[PDB]
Scaffold this active site. Sequence first.
Site, PDB file in Angstrom:
ATOM      1  N   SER A   1      -1.626 -16.429  21.537  1.00 45.07           N
ATOM      2  CA  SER A   1      -2.955 -16.820  22.031  1.00 45.07           C
ATOM      3  C   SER A   1      -3.058 -16.598  23.512  1.00 45.07           C
ATOM      4  CB  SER A   1      -3.219 -18.292  21.757  1.00 45.07           C
ATOM      5  OG  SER A   1      -4.413 -18.708  22.405  1.00 45.07           O
TER       6      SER A   1
ATOM      7  N   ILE B   1       5.528 -21.918  28.200  1.00 44.58           N
ATOM      8  CA  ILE B   1       6.382 -22.673  29.125  1.00 44.58           C
ATOM      9  C   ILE B   1       7.260 -21.735  29.956  1.00 44.58           C
ATOM     10  CG2 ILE B   1       8.240 -24.353  29.418  1.00 44.58           C
ATOM     11  CD1 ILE B   1       5.459 -25.317  28.363  1.00 44.58           C
TER      12      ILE B   1
ATOM     13  N   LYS C   1      23.584 -18.178  39.076  1.00 49.34           N
ATOM     14  CA  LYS C   1      23.938 -19.555  38.828  1.00 49.34           C
ATOM     15  C   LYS C   1      25.423 -19.621  38.455  1.00 49.34           C
ATOM     16  CE  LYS C   1      23.337 -23.309  35.479  1.00 49.34           C
ATOM     17  NZ  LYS C   1      22.938 -23.586  34.041  1.00 49.34           N
TER      18      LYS C   1
ATOM     19  N   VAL D   1      -4.002 -18.262  15.874  1.00 47.48           N
ATOM     20  CA  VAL D   1      -3.965 -18.713  14.485  1.00 47.48           C
ATOM     21  C   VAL D   1      -4.707 -20.045  14.409  1.00 47.48           C
ATOM     22  CG1 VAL D   1      -2.509 -19.438  12.539  1.00 47.48           C
ATOM     23  CG2 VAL D   1      -1.737 -17.577  14.101  1.00 47.48           C
TER      24      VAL D   1
ATOM     25  N   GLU E   1      21.536 -29.610  30.703  1.00 47.80           N
ATOM     26  CA  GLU E   1      22.650 -28.687  30.643  1.00 47.80           C
ATOM     27  C   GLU E   1      22.233 -27.264  30.261  1.00 47.80           C
ATOM     28  OE1 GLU E   1      25.827 -28.682  31.520  1.00 47.80           O
ATOM     29  OE2 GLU E   1      26.066 -30.748  32.130  1.00 47.80           O
TER      30      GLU E   1
ATOM     31  N   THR F   1      20.228 -25.581  28.053  1.00 49.30           N
ATOM     32  CA  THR F   1      20.530 -25.188  26.672  1.00 49.30           C
ATOM     33  C   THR F   1      19.273 -24.689  25.963  1.00 49.30           C
ATOM     34  OG1 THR F   1      20.303 -27.563  26.112  1.00 49.30           O
ATOM     35  CG2 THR F   1      22.528 -26.667  26.180  1.00 49.30           C
TER      36      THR F   1
HETATM   37  C1  LIG Z   1      10.379 -29.249  31.246  1.00 48.33           C
HETATM   38  C2  LIG Z   1      11.163 -28.145  30.578  1.00 48.33           C
HETATM   39  C3  LIG Z   1      12.259 -27.621  31.263  1.00 48.33           C
HETATM   40  C4  LIG Z   1      13.038 -26.597  30.721  1.00 48.33           C
HETATM   41  N1  LIG Z   1      14.131 -26.059  31.416  1.00 48.33           N
HETATM   42  C5  LIG Z   1      14.899 -25.053  30.851  1.00 48.33           C
HETATM   43  C6  LIG Z   1      16.016 -24.533  31.538  1.00 48.33           C
HETATM   44  O1  LIG Z   1      16.323 -24.904  32.672  1.00 48.33           O
HETATM   45  N2  LIG Z   1      16.754 -23.559  30.942  1.00 48.33           N
HETATM   46  C7  LIG Z   1      16.429 -23.099  29.668  1.00 48.33           C
HETATM   47  O2  LIG Z   1      17.126 -22.242  29.152  1.00 48.33           O
HETATM   48  N3  LIG Z   1      15.335 -23.575  28.961  1.00 48.33           N
HETATM   49  C8  LIG Z   1      14.570 -24.565  29.566  1.00 48.33           C
HETATM   50  N4  LIG Z   1      13.470 -25.073  28.900  1.00 48.33           N
HETATM   51  C9  LIG Z   1      13.108 -24.521  27.545  1.00 48.33           C
HETATM   52  C10 LIG Z   1      12.240 -23.267  27.809  1.00 48.33           C
HETATM   53  O3  LIG Z   1      11.199 -23.380  28.788  1.00 48.33           O
HETATM   54  C11 LIG Z   1      11.428 -22.910  26.532  1.00 48.33           C
HETATM   55  O4  LIG Z   1      12.136 -23.226  25.391  1.00 48.33           O
HETATM   56  C12 LIG Z   1      11.215 -21.443  26.484  1.00 48.33           C
HETATM   57  O5  LIG Z   1      10.787 -20.974  27.769  1.00 48.33           O
HETATM   58  C13 LIG Z   1      10.295 -20.992  25.319  1.00 48.33           C
HETATM   59  O6  LIG Z   1       9.504 -21.952  24.613  1.00 48.33           O
HETATM   60  P1  LIG Z   1       8.740 -21.403  23.270  1.00 48.33           P
HETATM   61  O7  LIG Z   1       8.544 -19.948  23.505  1.00 48.33           O
HETATM   62  O8  LIG Z   1       9.342 -21.919  21.999  1.00 48.33           O
HETATM   63  O9  LIG Z   1       7.273 -22.134  23.386  1.00 48.33           O
HETATM   64  P2  LIG Z   1       6.096 -21.828  24.448  1.00 48.33           P
HETATM   65  O10 LIG Z   1       6.539 -21.459  25.837  1.00 48.33           O
HETATM   66  O11 LIG Z   1       5.373 -23.198  24.422  1.00 48.33           O
HETATM   67  O12 LIG Z   1       5.148 -20.652  23.956  1.00 48.33           O
HETATM   68  C14 LIG Z   1       4.398 -20.901  22.791  1.00 48.33           C
HETATM   69  C15 LIG Z   1       3.672 -19.630  22.421  1.00 48.33           C
HETATM   70  O13 LIG Z   1       3.013 -19.853  21.177  1.00 48.33           O
HETATM   71  C16 LIG Z   1       1.652 -19.471  21.300  1.00 48.33           C
HETATM   72  N5  LIG Z   1       0.839 -20.288  20.379  1.00 48.33           N
HETATM   73  C17 LIG Z   1       0.832 -21.636  20.172  1.00 48.33           C
HETATM   74  N6  LIG Z   1      -0.101 -21.919  19.205  1.00 48.33           N
HETATM   75  C18 LIG Z   1      -0.656 -20.753  18.815  1.00 48.33           C
HETATM   76  C19 LIG Z   1      -1.650 -20.454  17.877  1.00 48.33           C
HETATM   77  N7  LIG Z   1      -2.123 -21.425  17.102  1.00 48.33           N
HETATM   78  N8  LIG Z   1      -2.003 -19.140  17.697  1.00 48.33           N
HETATM   79  C20 LIG Z   1      -1.415 -18.138  18.439  1.00 48.33           C
HETATM   80  N9  LIG Z   1      -0.420 -18.448  19.368  1.00 48.33           N
HETATM   81  C21 LIG Z   1      -0.068 -19.727  19.544  1.00 48.33           C
HETATM   82  C22 LIG Z   1       1.307 -19.765  22.750  1.00 48.33           C
HETATM   83  O14 LIG Z   1       0.198 -19.002  23.131  1.00 48.33           O
HETATM   84  C23 LIG Z   1       2.599 -19.294  23.432  1.00 48.33           C
HETATM   85  O15 LIG Z   1       2.569 -17.905  23.527  1.00 48.33           O
HETATM   86  C24 LIG Z   1      12.705 -26.104  29.451  1.00 48.33           C
HETATM   87  C25 LIG Z   1      11.599 -26.636  28.762  1.00 48.33           C
HETATM   88  C26 LIG Z   1      10.818 -27.659  29.311  1.00 48.33           C
HETATM   89  C27 LIG Z   1       9.624 -28.174  28.524  1.00 48.33           C
HETATM   90 CL   LIG Z   2      17.299 -26.518  28.896  1.00 40.93          CL
END
Ligand SMILES: Cc1cc2nc3c(=O)[nH]c(=O)nc-3n(C[C@H](O)[C@H](O)[C@H](O)COP(=O)(O)OP(=O)(O)OC[C@H]3O[C@@H](n4cnc5c(N)ncnc54)[C@H](O)[C@@H]3O)c2cc1C
Ligand SMILES: [Cl-]
Lengths: 517, 517
Positions: free
Chosen positions: B38, B44, B78, B186, B345, B347
């Site tokens: 989307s 994130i 790092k 979606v 950590e 992860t």
């Molecule tokens: C505060 C925080 C700190 C973090 N620090 C670290 C770190 O230091 N090191 C590390 O390795 N990881 C870290 N992480 C984890 C990392 O940021 C995320 O896991 C990673 O970047 C990817 O998340 P994701 O892609 O599963 O979800 P998201 O980044 O949330 O992306 C979701 C995707 O799904 C799409 N989407 C959602 N609903 C729909 C829909 N209905 N239709 C079409 N598309 C949709 C959105 O548009 C987006 O593209 C951290 C996370 C958080 C929250």
């Molecule tokens: Cl993390």
Amino acid sequence: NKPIKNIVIVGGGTAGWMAASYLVRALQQQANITLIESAAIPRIGVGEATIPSLQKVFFDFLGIPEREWMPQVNGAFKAAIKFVNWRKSPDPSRDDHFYHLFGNVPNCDGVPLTHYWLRKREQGFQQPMEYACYPQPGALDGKLAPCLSDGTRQMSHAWHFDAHLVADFLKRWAVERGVNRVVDEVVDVRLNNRGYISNLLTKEGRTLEADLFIDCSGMRGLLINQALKEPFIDMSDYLLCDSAVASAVPNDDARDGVEPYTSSIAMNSGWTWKIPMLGRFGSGYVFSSHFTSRDQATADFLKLWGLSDNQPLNQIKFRVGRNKRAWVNNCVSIGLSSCFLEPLESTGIYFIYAALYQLVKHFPDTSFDPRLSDAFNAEIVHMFDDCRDFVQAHYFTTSRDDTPFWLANRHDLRLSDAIKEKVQRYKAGLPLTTTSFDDSTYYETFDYEFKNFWLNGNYYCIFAGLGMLPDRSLPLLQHRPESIEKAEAMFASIRREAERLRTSLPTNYDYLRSLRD
Amino acid sequence: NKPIKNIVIVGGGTAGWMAASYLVRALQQQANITLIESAAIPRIGVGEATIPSLQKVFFDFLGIPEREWMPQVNGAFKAAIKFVNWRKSPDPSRDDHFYHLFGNVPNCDGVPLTHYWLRKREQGFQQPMEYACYPQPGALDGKLAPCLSDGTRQMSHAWHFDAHLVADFLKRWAVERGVNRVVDEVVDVRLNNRGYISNLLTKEGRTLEADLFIDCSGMRGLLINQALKEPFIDMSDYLLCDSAVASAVPNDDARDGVEPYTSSIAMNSGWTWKIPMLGRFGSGYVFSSHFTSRDQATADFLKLWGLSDNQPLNQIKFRVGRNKRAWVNNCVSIGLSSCFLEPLESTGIYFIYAALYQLVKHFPDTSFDPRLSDAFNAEIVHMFDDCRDFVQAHYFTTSRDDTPFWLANRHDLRLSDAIKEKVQRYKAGLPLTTTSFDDSTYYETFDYEFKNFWLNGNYYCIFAGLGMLPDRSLPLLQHRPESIEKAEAMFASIRREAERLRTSLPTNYDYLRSLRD
Ligand SMILES: Cc1cc2nc3c(=O)[nH]c(=O)nc-3n(C[C@H](O)[C@H](O)[C@H](O)COP(=O)(O)OP(=O)(O)OC[C@H]3O[C@@H](n4cnc5c(N)ncnc54)[C@H](O)[C@@H]3O)c2cc1C
Ligand SMILES: [Cl-]
Ligand SMILES: Cc1cc2nc3c(=O)[nH]c(=O)nc-3n(C[C@H](O)[C@H](O)[C@H](O)COP(=O)(O)OP(=O)(O)OC[C@H]3O[C@@H](n4cnc5c(N)ncnc54)[C@H](O)[C@@H]3O)c2cc1C
Ligand SMILES: [Cl-]
């Protein structure tokens, strides 16, 4: 003219018993009051949230202090409504909440602090309006009590309670003061040829007569709608919800605390209230049947609280709107017989005691001078339509677009000229009605509050909370840098007060327990 | 059985694009991959810290060397996490830091050097464990690079980068290799009567079908949680934080250098990360809303970095825990849709590529044999719960007692039998899992690393850093004075290596600049 002496109230819910007790108190002499209530027809008590005027207008009038009635209704403290997921489509990674606080915002050189806050916001200031302009919301985030442990008030507050217990408490109070209680059901209503109520026929064969009838029969409007045929103005063009599914949900107060506020959690096709008490919270998903089925709403409500398919649910419907006239001939409607607005801003019981206050202020004799009922009726129209518009302004101002329900709220409501005009003034950067009074003075001056019910700060909490801000700050402020500085000292006081509250207030749970577990 | 041919990935964050690229690489033939993401729903990317397996498991698999991807994501180096103020209540006159280093500790006659260090400590030795047992922490204190100027590796390292840019880099890579990208949202998910996903309905009216669905929708778990109703196991009984407030903070790299490590700075009600890149660091105060308000956490975060009330902040919430099962029917969850652990950590992205590695190792056909998904699911449970416990062991082992938050961590967490048992063995003086492999071999053998993720040295850095030491050194060592002497020669080598690094490494800032400013 002869005085009204005999009064019959139909209904033993919150309205009926508030009416009996307000009237037995107001009518010190020459008053014979009988309340008839059916054992087979339920009363509405969902777990109810209220506003501070309940004490100042209602219980104070009865001479009942908070410390007397609150324990008897297992009451809990309410300092605000917290709106969750109202601003944007829900995103579990985003915190979307804002508060509508009790109390009012101070002024600085004749301009409310909200307006100084917006100017700062134009310059990059990040802090949300209500956290800048009010001392208590972070305390509410911390689930703190509205009083110090010794009972010193520290912020404006009202109450959550089961309204059944309030009806019960007032029944006891009013019957002790000579109200005649009849447990029986009105089956027929006889009108004379002029259309005044002559008498009521009951299931047990009693014939009730009176000088004045108070219809507290609930949504059916037994007297006002069914007998007297007063039209009900359906306002489903203004507000879409028509249904709720409600329950109580056990709370682990020792682990999770007790939130000192009502929450309104926006759903796909409505919103869910949460009304904390000791040991449980009341909750109801208020929804529009045009956008979701009761079965779907029920599933959503269950999923929200992780509740099981065995949990008993209170399935509710309602019609939003009001009678064309609240008082017709010798019958005054009070409560759900008079009008209904969804509980978004805790106005249901308010309409009861505000209507009662106005009835006494317009109290008839047996001649039923239409000038008194006309004046009363116009007050009720003003009261209701004003709250209707304030509630509606929560809906049409949101920028949620994720469901048909939110889209219809954004685009398809009928809006009064009055609300359009208030929004225009807000958007232009103008203050809405402000008060110079302290919170105490405002809540002690009911003729003022009744007419100036929603103030600048109330509208700001909602509009700012929903991310709808004025086009610009007041042009006047560009000419008054000293006033802007004075306002800074006020923001600094507020921040100090918030920090003192952080470390001085007991938790709401501890304070409630100390009043009596 | 017919092969899985059509694969739909929902989500274009780090998970979605890692999934697209890992799968387009693994599935050399008979694979049609479509990713839908989307434009209206954010991804994130806070500025992210990683671990060395990102290269060995992920980028190596894609055939992308560090020198190719790192510049494109403005990556920085790092070498460790540095924990600040975790051991004792903060005292500005005391230096309270310790490192959790990458790499592993060598063994001397079958006993890790940590254990010889503890015996010395029993005898009065003052030097902290990690400065005795690892060659690099003083180099990290000096902000030195993990490589010589010519690129010769001098210590294990991973990366800091904005994850948005990594998603972007992989989008480009995967689309070039034939992944079909759809920018659309979606809105509905249709399941057949057996509960498998049949199709996805989008905002723009497309109907997506597939043999296999990968849920990369983020925390909302669009497919796995919302559609398929897989329970989420909330683990807030294990770990208290549920919130963060984050920003980037300008760094004067020329004056202050660029720290070659992530820092975790313990706060009153959580901890703040610091993730250095060129020109700025990412930072976020991770906090528990039960112990502080977002507004207070925000104030603390601002004060920490001397930031102004005009600085834009990323206000985040999360739920710690994981799905009961990661892969249900024809839907595999990967990333935040699968689970979440606070970044203590580093992860988060690890869980993405480790899950992807296991998906390919358990890759289904269209029959969806539940034995393959059961095996996959058990690997994910093991992976997550093991990291959960390792992170939790930072919290319950601290002796900070200065705030309710630290007291609850010391006393009120729910601890797994597995972690209790590891702590028991540690306290008894026993080594936890050790490896005989060089760091290179360990990080090249992923089936080994995946199951033996946290080794003796990892736990020692944390427990020793927090001032929680075993009851005694190994009784065996009283019988082996020659081994104790051999260990002394190893400590002497390590000290020599530290001194050579001091005068041989470029600063991290200079080395980063030389790669390209
Ligand atoms: C505060 C925080 C700190 C973090 N620090 C670290 C770190 O230091 N090191 C590390 O390795 N990881 C870290 N992480 C984890 C990392 O940021 C995320 O896991 C990673 O970047 C990817 O998340 P994701 O892609 O599963 O979800 P998201 O980044 O949330 O992306 C979701 C995707 O799904 C799409 N989407 C959602 N609903 C729909 C829909 N209905 N239709 C079409 N598309 C949709 C959105 O548009 C987006 O593209 C951290 C996370 C958080 C929250
Ligand atoms: Cl993390
Ligand atoms: C879903 C919902 C949520 C609400 N939330 C709030 C809130 O948060 N805060 C708030 O302040 N208010 C709230 N309200 C409003 C509040 O519950 C009611 O207005 C209030 O409790 C009293 O209603 P009432 O007494 O007029 O009618 P009822 O509770 O319906 O009682 C009607 C009485 O009339 C009697 N009766 C009816 N017909 C006959 C008959 N023919 N003969 C004899 N007796 C008869 C019945 O037996 C009963 O005693 C809410 C209302 C609803 C529906
Ligand atoms: Cl209400």
